[PDB]
Amino acid sequence: NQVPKWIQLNNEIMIQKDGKFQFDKDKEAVHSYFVDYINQNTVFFHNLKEKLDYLVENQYYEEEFLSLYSFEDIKEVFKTAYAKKFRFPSFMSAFKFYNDYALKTNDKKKILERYEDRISIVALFFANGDTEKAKEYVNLMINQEYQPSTPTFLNAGRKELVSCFLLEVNDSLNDISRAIDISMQLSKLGGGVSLNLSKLRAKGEAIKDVENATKGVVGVMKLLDNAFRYASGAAYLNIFHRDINDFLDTKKISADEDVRVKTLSIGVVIPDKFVELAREDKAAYVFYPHTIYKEYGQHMDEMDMNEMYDKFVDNPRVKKEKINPRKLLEKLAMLRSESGYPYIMFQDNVNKVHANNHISKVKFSNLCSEVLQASQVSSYTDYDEEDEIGLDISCNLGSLNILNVMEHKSIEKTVKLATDSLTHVSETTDIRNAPAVRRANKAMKSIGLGAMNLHGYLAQNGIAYESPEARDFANTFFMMVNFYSIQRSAEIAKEKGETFDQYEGSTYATGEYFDKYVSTDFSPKYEKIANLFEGMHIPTTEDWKKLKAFVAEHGMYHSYRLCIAPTGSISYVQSSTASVMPIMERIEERTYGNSKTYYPMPGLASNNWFFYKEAYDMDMFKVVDMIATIQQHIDQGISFTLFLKDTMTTRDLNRIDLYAHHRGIKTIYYART
Amino acid sequence: NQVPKWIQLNNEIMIQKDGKFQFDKDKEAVHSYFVDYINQNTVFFHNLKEKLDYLVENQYYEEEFLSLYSFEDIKEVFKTAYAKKFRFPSFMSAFKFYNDYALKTNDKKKILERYEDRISIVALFFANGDTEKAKEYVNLMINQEYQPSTPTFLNAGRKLVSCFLLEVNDSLNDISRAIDISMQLSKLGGGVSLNLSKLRAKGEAIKDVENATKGVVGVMKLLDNAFRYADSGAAYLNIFHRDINDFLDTKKISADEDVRVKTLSIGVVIPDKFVELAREDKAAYVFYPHTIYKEYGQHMDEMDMNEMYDKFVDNPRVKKEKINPRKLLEKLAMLRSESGYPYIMFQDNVNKVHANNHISKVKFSNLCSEVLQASQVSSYTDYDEEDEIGLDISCNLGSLNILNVMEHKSIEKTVKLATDSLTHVSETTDIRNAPAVRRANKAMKSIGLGAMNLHGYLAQNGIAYESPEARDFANTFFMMVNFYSIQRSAEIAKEKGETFDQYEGSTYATGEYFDKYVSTDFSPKYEKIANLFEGMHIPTTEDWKKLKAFVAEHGMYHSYRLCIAPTGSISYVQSSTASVMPIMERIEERTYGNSKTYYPMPGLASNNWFFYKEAYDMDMFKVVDMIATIQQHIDQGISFTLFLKDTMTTRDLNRIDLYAHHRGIKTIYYART
Ligand SMILES: Nc1ncnc2c1ncn2[C@H]1C[C@H](O)[C@@H](COP(=O)(O)OP(=O)(O)OP(=O)(O)O)O1
């Protein structure tokens, strides 16, 4: 019943020694943890050869790519991995990896893969042919300079791989059947699956023969809520719809028995016209979209609300409904004061900066509220009848440490390797049950790259989080990031000579995206910021012009490059902070079982106590301006999370909302208190 | 509650497949045993250096001798050990080593030393300076060509001799000193046996008042209580003593409450005069030895019974007692029919072949009934009074496989290494509570070498156990063994120039022991026997003459060389039979717990079923003649064990006893039925 030694040592840090914390004990706890639990459950082997032979003959490793080299080259790779003599810096830095991510045995009671093992297996998977490139991946990963995404880091060479799926539901019975089918298919693959209910007819409407026959959106939500309980995502909705009130009555603290969704989140799509009507204090008109489909032939949100709203008001054909926008934003503020639900996307900020609006305009987002790409709906006909295949969105992920990049200045080569890595991942991927995801993943070739460790590095260097210097720093940094990113994409496009489809329809072929960079140079405006990037080259606008010419030579290989995800579950292995959202508390406290695990933030010393500010004690406006400065280079959304208090006000909340709409923040997240 | 896989596979052998046994399953069980229990409890390490550093800093290895080399030489030794790719041949071949002998952890739940580890640590302990000699010890041990004794194999480099022989002089102070030394050695775990020759008997005068002595039974009672306090030996007695009947009434199936010894065994010393009196059917006279001590000044068994028996009969001073010898041997046969107790030593067979009778004559033996050396009694005076130190016997052990010696023909170099090994062991030994053991172990330098695996090798080659060919084979083999043994002892005596004390008093300096070997050559008398030793040199009697001259040059380093012990507890690791006693059953069956472990004898196939005879179905006379042929070269005793049946007869038993006395067998053991 006694608590073991390392947990007891980890509980020692809260003892006040001269008003401080016992940080130096922490390593000792880690030095306990590698003696009394880890090195007494590892399966023992003589050497490498039999080890790998035992790993093959019990159905663990996919033996194909592990047969495509010599034994000696793999031995050199493992030798390069063990030559680091790597150590962990913190207590959770081991515990989150040797409990869940690292490979266990069949009885789930022993440990096979060491920390070099998993990384070097990932390295040979990203190699696909070159030994020295695999060594480059090792030197990239073992210095904690790059982190692949969660399911890629889990399921490399075992018994799918991308945790993000985005679909559309056309309007038929057959379409709803196909949608529930594909959701149950992807549900066992563990990824993130979110739907959208734009083009559906509303409640109390005619079904092809008889008026007032449709049970509406709530029944489809009920079927999906039962559907994900069998094997957890969300769904979005554009606001110009009668049942939007019933779409928002689901998340309710006085929850109805039938109106009860504990699985799916919800979210609202809002263009500028509704914002205008809520500002100027006038009426609003939600519609019956099936009447619009009968009238104009198209669907509702496939046209501009700013161009067509009063025209639908003027049509006697479209049955309408008048409501109050201001009371509706008040109700949104109340429901976000309850929890923070739903989600919010401002599409006009997105499409006016989007490159690929010539295919379609972005209407929705994933569960992770980040990926904003084109989406064409399919049409699933009857059994012997053939179908028509639209386009879908499937985004594999991956971020990186800012800190070690700043330590080593190999940021270019870092992007060079990570781009090829995610490229080979999207090469490898195949799903054999949803054909539109198949066609789009072959077609669009969308990769997603981001970064964590913003708060901690700049807080450890002694720069406040609300400083303008950090905003200029992030501006110059992400400018150079996007520069080398497009540079590598153009290089690979020259290597293959095969861009994505309808490349001339993009703004990339015209250089309209490049028109921001031909002027308005992003040189550092502070000396202390300039000392940080001091020691390496920073490009000029003429380098952007040479880049524009080199793009105009061939083109770009990818259609999307960047994403920012709240990668907290693999934040702990990199032993760092979250992404760009600053930290909540200086000390995290968990109870694994009969235990009080005490996690300090990395870099917690006496001097930098003030730069480790608290999330409840910050200027939200400067945070939004930081995220807007970050937004200057990112194609997709940014995982912006609101940090609130009970003492705050929905007046101030909606002021922050309209402030972010005025700045141009794409999406937000669930709010915390 | 389910039986694990390897035990279930080991129980499969008794299934009759075509009237046979499932031998081929057995390896599979062993191949199970190294997957599901062993390789999932070994503490995992990166490489050698940290491993040894962790082993030092937790008080496991004595760090002195493990600091007397380079790291690289130790790495070469471990590399030579792992270069064998050694495997076990049987199921118990692992289970008796990874359960008790190999090193565990502090919580006794994990395993640190592998099978290479223990052997190579023993190798560096026997090295004491030379790397190549340590590699020679590795090449000796890892081919299973030599096995050191049990406590040396256990306690090398941790926190050493299992055989102690003492004498008890006659005072109160002496009995105090005896119980003191027995309790001192009792925590050291060795074998300790006493002897009660020079004590006065029951009902006798204690220095002032007649009929005051409680006798031998009270001292036995104190020793029986004494060994119950710590982590069990025995005691011997010469037969010419009144209380011998009470000395034999202790081991009784109708056991008295007071007369009850469940700890100490007992044993009888018999010279030729009592054998003569029992043959010729006359009277016998046991004595009161304290009267003899008052009369002649010496003690009783320090003079010849054949020279002095009728002279003590003729003395009116010595009070005597007349008894029947024939009924006494009948009672001995009855008590051995009960269990097999007591032990029996025929000293006149021993002393007439003993080399060192000029110091004293052997009067007794150890617990293991094998070591027969000189022994001078001490005299423990009062507190401020100084004492006088006698001589004691302490024999470290060690045997070898016959089989691998026959495989490799390196018998000479084998003896060369094993002699230096036991030499360094007797160098290392020190006890700091019994001064006479200290003085004798510095003085006499007695080593003990033997052999196991007689029955199995010659049974596997297809030669019957009762054959004369095996007797000639063993004669030639042990002749060459003793030849190279004395050769190496003379070499080491030349190396040091320091023989043991009173070397000129021995028969070795006079060559009287060598007079057997100057003639009567032991050439093989059979062709099939000659093919076995074919391929190597066998010496001649002129080589014995050169040996005699080389001995006469310097001398011999040791005073004793050979011993034969029932080394069953380390028989299983060598994966072989016992020593020269043939096997009891073809299959051993044990119950570890909720289990039926089935051990086959090694080499059990269909063809050699007949040469694997049964111990209850053999000629005892040919066994005694085999042991007498073995006795032709051994200085000490031989662990001869009787194998009896309930259908046998004490008439036949006593006939076998007198037959062995007529042949010249030194000692016997407890009998089995
Ligand atoms: N933070 C850690 N990360 C990884 N392994 C660790 C960590 N802490 C301890 N260990 C591992 C390494 C070793 O196998 C064992 C402890 O040995 P360790 O002392 O850490 O290495 P070391 O040999 O380089 O230092 P030293 O020479 O002082 O012993 O457990």
Ligand SMILES: Nc1ncnc2c1ncn2[C@H]1C[C@H](O)[C@@H](COP(=O)(O)OP(=O)(O)OP(=O)(O)O)O1
């Ligand atoms: N029995 C039903 N109960 C509720 N809703 C239904 C039922 N049958 C059909 N629907 C709903 C869901 C469908 O998306 C929608 C129209 O159904 P469906 O017959 O598949 O369309 P359709 O392609 O045949 O022609 P139309 O565009 O005129 O509706 O109404």
Ligand SMILES: Nc1ncnc2c1ncn2[C@H]1C[C@H](O)[C@@H](COP(=O)(O)OP(=O)(O)OP(=O)(O)O)O1
């Ligand atoms: N009898 C045994 N003695 C010692 N180790 C054994 C024994 N049986 C199995 N093992 C050990 C050796 C390995 O660490 C593991 C089993 O691998 P094992 O197959 O025996 O060796 P191997 O690699 O030489 O043969 P193979 O190439 O066919 O796999 O457990």
Ligand SMILES: Nc1ncnc2c1ncn2[C@H]1C[C@H](O)[C@@H](COP(=O)(O)OP(=O)(O)OP(=O)(O)O)O1
């Ligand atoms: N109180 C006693 N009860 C029983 N036995 C005793 C007792 N005292 C002494 N003895 C026994 C054990 C001794 O070995 C033996 C003689 O005792 P002890 O006085 O020590 O001999 P001693 O050296 O003084 O002279 P002596 O040779 O005449 O006996 O008798």
